[PDB]
Paper text:
Despite these low concentrations, proteins have a great technological relevance in winemaking as some of them, the grape pathogenesis-related (PR) proteins, can aggregate to form a visible haze. Among the grape PR-proteins, the thaumatin-like proteins (TLPs) and chitinases can undergo changes in structural integrity, particularly under certain conditions such as when wines are exposed to elevated temperatures during storage or transportation. In this paper the crystal structure and some physico-chemical parameters relevant for the haze formation mechanism of three isoforms of TLPs isolated from grape juice were determined. Plant TLPs generally have three domains and a cleft located between domains I and II.
Domain I is the largest and is made of 11 β-strands (β2, β3, β5, β8, β9, and β14 on the front; β1, β4, β10, β11, and β14 on the back), forming a β-sandwich of two β-sheets. The two β-sheets are stabilized by four disulfide bonds (residues 33–221, 89–95, 136–210, and 141–193). Domain II consists of a long α-helix (α4) and four α-helical segments (α1, α2, α3, and α5), and is stabilized by four disulfide bonds (residues 141–193, 149–159, 163–172, 173–180). The short domain III comprised 33 amino acid residues (residues 72–105), and includes a long loop and 2 β-strands (β6 and β7). This domain is stabilized by two disulfide bonds (residues 74–84, 89–95). Two disulfide bonds are shared by different domains: disulfide bond 89–95 connects domain I to III, while bond 141–193 connects domain I to II. Isoform differences in heat stability have practical and economic ramifications for winemaking. However, from the structures of the three proteins, it is clear that they only significantly differ in two loop regions. From the detailed analysis of their structural features it appears that the difference in function among proteins is attributable to the differences observed in a loop located between β-strands 9 and 10 and of the neighbouring regions.
Author numbering: 25 to 225
């Protein structure tokens, strides 16, 4: 499958993918990423305010993946996430936008083939609106990241929405706002669909 990863922000971002790596995308530039059929735990995200040396080692203000330009591991919150698992049960791809690891950059994540048309977006000014307890440089953290309790992180107990998850959910109703926000955040397409991930759509 092909992911068309497009930076429509006026600022440069450093696109990241696992599997895939990462590259600098100036405003208006795009990356076509091949993603094999059957991939699980897939993510695409943007990183902000990075500075990398000649060998691809360095730092990003949001979404840093172990100091690498070409990510092999997930990024450090906050990072708006396009998540996917391809060719799963019932001849389906499963995909979502997640704010469970926070928000940095607005995002659309849409199918582009196979007669799959229903996509996803989170475009609110979540950084400008972020509550004080969640705010950080370049982003808005999920309360699981900030507080690290089961109320927000749901390893055990009864996982329900919280005022801090609801902040994200009412502003981006399409996206996961807390770990068990499954019922209203799950998108599917026929297996084998292509996708776009657009920063600042």
């Amino acid at each position: 499958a092909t992911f068309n990863i497009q930076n429509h922000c006026s600022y440069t971002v450093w696109a990241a993918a696992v599997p895939g790596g990462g590259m600098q995308l100036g405003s208006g530039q795009s990356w076509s990423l091949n993603v094999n059929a059957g991939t699980t735990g897939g993510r695409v995200w943007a990183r902000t305010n990075c500075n990398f040396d000649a060998s691809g080692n360095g730092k990003c203000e949001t979404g840093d993946c172990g100091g690498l330009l070409q990510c092999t591991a997930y990024g450090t919150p906050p990072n708006t996430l396009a998540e996917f698992a391809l060719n799963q049960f019932s001849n389906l791809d499963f995909f979502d936008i997640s704010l469970v690891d926070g928000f940095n950059v607005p995002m659309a994540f849409n199918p582009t083939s196979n007669g799959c048309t229903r996509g996803i977006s989170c475009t609110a000014d979540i950084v400008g609106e972020c509550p004080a307890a969640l705010k950080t440089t370049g982003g808005c953290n999920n309360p699981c990241t900030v507080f690290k309790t089961d109320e927000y992180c749901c390893n055990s107990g009864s996982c329900s929405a919280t005022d801090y998850s609801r902040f994200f959910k009412t502003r981006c109703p399409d996206a996961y706002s807390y770990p068990k926000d499954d019922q209203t955040s799950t998108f599917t397409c026929t297996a084998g669909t292509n996708y776009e991930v657009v920063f600042c759509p």
